[model samples]
Target: KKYRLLFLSTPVGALGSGIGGGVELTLQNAAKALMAKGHEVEIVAPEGSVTNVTKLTPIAGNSQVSAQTQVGTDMVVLPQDSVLENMWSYAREVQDQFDLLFNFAYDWLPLYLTPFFHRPIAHWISMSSLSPVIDAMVSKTVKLCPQAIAVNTRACADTFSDGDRLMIMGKGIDVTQYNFVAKPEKPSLAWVGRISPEKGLEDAAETAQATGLPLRVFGLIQDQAYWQQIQNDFPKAEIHYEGFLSTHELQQKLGQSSALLMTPRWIEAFGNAAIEAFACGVPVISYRSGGLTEIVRHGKTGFLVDMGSVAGLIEAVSKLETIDRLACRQQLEEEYSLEVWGDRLEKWFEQLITSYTL
Candidate 1:
């Protein structure tokens, strides 16, 4: 059955903001998936956020959420003039026009306001549980609407007490855009993600220093101070910061590397970069933390290292030749394609809609 789906994007930052970088990819992919299934999808985002992905309905408001604020905080503290609230206010206004509402925001407001809405709101939470208040709200929402919440990985869903209630939806990408290179011209390591402290970029730099391999970094500078500190500490490390590039541009640069390194200090909800690397036929060497364990097929497409173990990374670097680049691309094609993603998403939405109305 075809349905009108409205997606509410993260209101804390624009679609392009590195703060909510993965959400941009998720939203775009979700829209493409739904539309391919013959469903009408419209995106509601804060003004100034731009995208070539879909028909975006820009809502006017000030962004009040930040990833930085969630760290070391028990509860989310929203500004009095919250853009999150404003964006939802618009969602509420247009609620009757859609058959289902998919929320891509990690903020607490959407969960809290779900019950008040006349229409069903299916939340696709974008991050792991960090705030106590958000956990409480999510718990309540799950109890009230059991099929309403979904997470990207089992690790992220496990963060809540009623985690079993949240559906696990893995992400997908346009594999055609990522060209495969069997052999890199140069033997270098690549890392991609927002330049934030939680990403553990220092660990990647240390790995480069230890292995004497040039590390190509691709991401937006979310924290200038944190990036500067890495530069100061790794003055002698052969690290190059290739400022954030478009998906096409990034894939070209990333595919030229022998492997991609993931060193996130915090629990990741899902590692989209890892899959993107797989699409480019690039092996991934990631710290065994959060969702990386679920994505990386160790000893095959990539290797998983112990967290904070630079020596483990060095060992993995030495064994990079054992991994098959073709296997990495094939794994992506078999599991993370948009067709598979869309089929799963459509089934999930149907189940949620049917269950809610009953």
Candidate 2:
């Protein structure tokens, strides 16, 4: 049976513009995949440009509560916004038109709204570490939501206790664009993400300096002062600042780059850029923090350096020749490609809708 699904997000630029970070990429990929499977999918979000897309009613001043849907299915897919405002709104609206609501990521809003509606909701949390605030939020919302999925099993265990509705869903990349090609000469070391202190762009610069390789850094510079500090410190390093690239350009850069550098200081929910790099047949020299170990097969697809260790990063670079670039690409194609992610999500949707009727 065919089902029409309403997928909600904070914006559309995330999917087409690559402006929304990883969440945007995931939703866009999932939506496209779902569409490919003969399911009618309409994205409801802040007005933005994407081919064959629709807009939700603008709530004026309350952009977060934007609403829209596709025909046939009485279900809404709410994205994790700044706090899950859309999910909360769905809880209050006429849910009869929707069989189930799906959310990605965990935030405070889910906790506040779930108890109010007790709707059968499916939430996929992308984080590995559980903070006190996150713990409090999960405690309140877990029981109220019907189905929960995590990107990794370890992350599932960390977030939900036994009897909690949770499943482990694998993360993926868009292989159509990310497929590997021959590596470029001169070896471009690339780092893509927000230019913030926690991301450790300075460490990537230092690694580039230590390895005597050129580094390409792409991401939004939220902190100008910090950006300047890193620029001044790495003045001699062959590091160039290229602001965020569109999905196409990012794929091109990653495809031709010699390797990817991920020097994160804190635990990440999941590293999309790293997976992207792998999909492009580039090796990643990343810190073994958060889900890095789970994403990159250390020494196979990429190297996992000791967390925050400059020496370890440098050492990994020296042995880069040992890593198989094709193998990295293969891993992405088989396990982390967009095609794979889409199939999994579509099945999950079908299962949920079926159970709702039962």
lDDT of each: 0.86, 0.65
What does candidate 1's lDDT look like per residue over 42-144, in tens digits?
Answer: 8988878887867898877677757556664676677766778888888899999998999988877898899889888899877777777777788899898
Instruction: Report the number of the highest-lDDT candidate.
Output: 1
Candidate 1 local lDDT, residue 338: 90
lDDT of 2 by residue, 229-256 (tens): 8868887778787887877788877777
- Model 1 scores what on Cα lDDT? 0.86
Q: What is the clash count of model 1?
A: 0
Scanning candidate 2 in windows of ten residues, the lowest lDDT window is 59-68
Error of 2 at 284 (Å): 0.7
| Cα shift from native, residue 180, model 2 (Å) | 3.1
Roughly what TM-score does model 1 have, to 2 decimal places?
A: 0.82
Model 1 misplaced regions, further than 4 Å:
13-20, 70-90, 193-212, 219-248, 264-269, 308-311
